Structures are given as structure tokens and as C-alpha cells.
Write a protein that binds this DNA or RNA. Structure first.
Ligand code: MG
Ligand code: MG
Ligand code: MG
Ligand code: MG
Ligand code: MG
Length: 215
DNA sequence: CCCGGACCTGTGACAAATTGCCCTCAGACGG
DNA sequence: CCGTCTGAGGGCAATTTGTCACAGGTCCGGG
């Protein structure tokens, strides 16, 4: 059975901007850390390729560029801002990378106030905003596999750090909402629907319902 | 009143970024 | 040693994401 990611809801709801490749790596860090810390984690090229069905070469490319793109990135818990890394990554051995996560982030990674999903649920998603949506939905999932939640549009925009043109609602619909609901429905075992909540002419919330395809 | 104006929607265009692929060649290891 | 399995480089064209102009709906209010 595949690895079970668990994380504090504060991370599920944090404001940050990460790529797909970076989020893939971030899932393993939370896994390494939780299985124990000083904050030093490690990534093997060949294991990454096998986990995500890549070649060794393209794995190397993904790890390398992800790693240098973390520099200057910051995380906000709603507020408090932290850097993800406190030293550049470096490779002691061929095919091996060593990384230094901000140890002050440990408690934000690790009661009842948590989110969980198996890694096989997300590893075919491509768009990182859809990984963010699927994580938020998991946070409200019931044991049996269903749930329903209303997310406010401004809060979606702030937390997922969506780009500026998606403050225009027709672009929000076309390039973020429809695409990410389609991936989830095509790439995960979840079957997802939604409806819009209005106040006057403005659309304010999105109401999500979902069930599991083992029913 | 009835136009111009402030709102809202969707779609056609184009620019910028990301995807999985492809090829080269030296490192690490063992037979 | 050398042949093989790796992975660190350099690239590519086809798709997807991010941006903005313009057509086309509603309601408001003062010349
Ligand atoms: Mg890649
Ligand atoms: Mg209005
Ligand atoms: Mg006219
Ligand atoms: Mg027409
Ligand atoms: Mg008009």
C-alpha cells in the first residue's frame, strides 16, 4: 500500500506559491520528518523516478531545478512568514541530494486538526493549483469518502496565490476552476461537482460536493 | 425620458511557461 | 582494466497557462 501523507491543516491552508515538482518533493519531506528532528532530509534520484514513473535523466532535471527555485520562497501562516530552506541544497554523493528545511517549520508540519491522503491519489495531477484544491477538499472528507464545503473566493485567491488576471471572474472560471475540477475528476478517485453562490451581481463562494468512486 | 456610464458575462487572440521527449558523454561499480 | 547502468548536461515541438480587447446583457440617474 502506498505512502500515507498527513499534514497539519495550517499547511493545507497556508499562503505560498510552489510548482508541481516542488510540491512532489515537499510531500516526501513531510513524510521523512514525520517518521521520527533537525530538519535535514534527503532525496534519491532513482527512487523519485520510480515513484512518479519518470526516467532517471528527467528526474535529475526535475529535482535540480525545483531545488534552486526554492531560494527566496516564503510561507505565511495566518500572520507569520518563514523561509522554507536555511541553506542551499547540495549533493554529497552522485544521485543523492541533501536539504535543510527551516526547523521552525516542524511544528507547522505536525490532535484532531489534520489532513490526510495517500500519495497515489495526487501523483498524476499536473496543475499545482489543483493539488492545492484536492488537499483542501481532503481536509473535509468523511471516513466513508464524501464531503461538502464552501470556500470563499477571496480566500482561495490569497491562499493559493493565484495570478492577478484571475481576479476577473470569467478568467477565474475558465483557466482555474473548470480545469482543476476536470483534472481531479480525471486523475484522482474522487468525483467532484460544484455550484456558485452569489450576492447581487458578484459571485462570492464556491460550494463543492464530492464522493468516492468506490461506491 | 433616454443616452452615457459602471457593472456583469463569455470568447478570440496572442504571449509566456510547462509538458514529456530526445541525444551526449563522463562517474561508479563489479566481473 | 572495460562494459554497463546512471544521471548530469544540452536541447526540442506540442500543449497549457496567463493576459487583455471587444461584443453584448442589466440597472442607474440627470441634461
Ligand atoms: Mg520536468
Ligand atoms: Mg454590482
Ligand atoms: Mg443606439
Ligand atoms: Mg453577433
Ligand atoms: Mg452596450
Amino acid at each position: 500500500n502506498s505512502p500515507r501523507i498527513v499534514q497539519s491543516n495550517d499547511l493545507t491552508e497556508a499562503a505560498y506559491s510552489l510548482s508541481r515538482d516542488q510540491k512532489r518533493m515537499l510531500y516526501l519531506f513531510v513524510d521523512q520528518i514525520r517518521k521520527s528532528h533537525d530538519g535535514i532530509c534527503e532525496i534519491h534520484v532513482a527512487k523519485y523516478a520510480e515513484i512518479f514513473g519518470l526516467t532517471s535523466a528527467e528526474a535529475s532535471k526535475d529535482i535540480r531545478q525545483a531545488l534552486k527555485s526554492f531560494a527566496g520562497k516564503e510561507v505565511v501562516f495566518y500572520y507569520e512568514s518563514f523561509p522554507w530552506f536555511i541553506k542551499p541544497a547540495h549533493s554529497p554523493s552522485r544521485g543523492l541530494y541533501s536539504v535543510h528545511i527551516n526547523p521552525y517549520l516542524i511544528p507547522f508540519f505536525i490532535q484532531n486538526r489534520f489532513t490526510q491522503f495517500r500519495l497515489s491519489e495526487t501523483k498524476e495531477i499536473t496543475n499545482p493549483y489543483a493539488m492545492r484544491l484536492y488537499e483542501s477538499l481532503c481536509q473535509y472528507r468523511k471516513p466513508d469518502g464524501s464531503g461538502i464545503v464552501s470556500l470563499k473566493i477571496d480566500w482561495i485567491i490569497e491562499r493559493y496565490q493565484l495570478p492577478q488576471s484571475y481576479q476577473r471572474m470569467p478568467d477565474f472560471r475558465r483557466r482555474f476552476l473548470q480545469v482543476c475540477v476536470n483534472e481531479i475528476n480525471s486523475r484522482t478517485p474522487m468525483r467532484l461537482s460544484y455550484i456558485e453562490k452569489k450576492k447581487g451581481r458578484q459571485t462570492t463562494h464556491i460550494v463543492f460536493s464530492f464522493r468516492d468512486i468506490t461506491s
